Design a protein around this ligand. Structure first.
Ligand SMILES: [Ca+2]
Ligand SMILES: [Ca+2]
Ligand SMILES: [Ca+2]
Ligand SMILES: [Ca+2]
Lengths: 137, 20
């Protein structure tokens, strides 16, 4: 049972996927998101991704089902490489900004800095792989 | 704030990689 703050936070995340704002994430919307992250899932894999979390079997992710879902090493490495575009071992504010922009979310530099700060543990102002793992685990 | 967003993206990536 999450907090009001956290729900609002996840609502913000959910909105990155729901491109038409109709309160439902479709396979087409998930596909758009995934391609904006450098991936190319097939129609079937997109259905599968939706199926794992779909409570009412209606084809799409609504907001409750999105939250439930948010309940391996190679998977985390592969995801880190999406953000760490120059492969230097650190996700910079600029790299995070780029990814968010391509997702259709134009953040101010302060908002980009706060997102990094939340994940940064050593306080060098970037996210390394170990900090990234911790964020997820 | 957007650590949920940063997490959501990462999780969704992890999901996609799973079914390779
Ligand atoms: Ca939608
Ligand atoms: Ca549904
Ligand atoms: Ca980098
Ligand atoms: Ca750091």
């Amino acid at each position: 049972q999450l907090t009001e703050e956290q729900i609002a936070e996840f609502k913000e995340a959910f909105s990155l996927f729901d491109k038409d704002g109709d309160g439902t994430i479709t396979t087409k919307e998930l596909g758009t998101v995934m391609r904006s992250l450098g991936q190319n899932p097939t129609e079937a894999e997109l259905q599968d991704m939706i199926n794992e979390v779909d409570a009412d079997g209606n084809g799409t992710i609504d907001f409750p089902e999105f939250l439930t879902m948010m309940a391996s090493e190679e998977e985390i490495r592969e995801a880190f490489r999406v953000f760490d575009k120059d492969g230097n071992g650190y996700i910079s504010a600029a790299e995070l900004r780029h990814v968010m922009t391509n997702l259709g979310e134009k953040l101010t530099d302060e908002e980009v800095d706060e997102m990094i700060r939340e994940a940064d543990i050593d306080g060098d102002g970037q996210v390394n792989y170990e900090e990234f793992v911790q964020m997820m685990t | 704030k957007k650590k949920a967003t940063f997490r959501a993206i990462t999780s969704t990536l992890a999901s996609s990689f799973k079914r390779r």
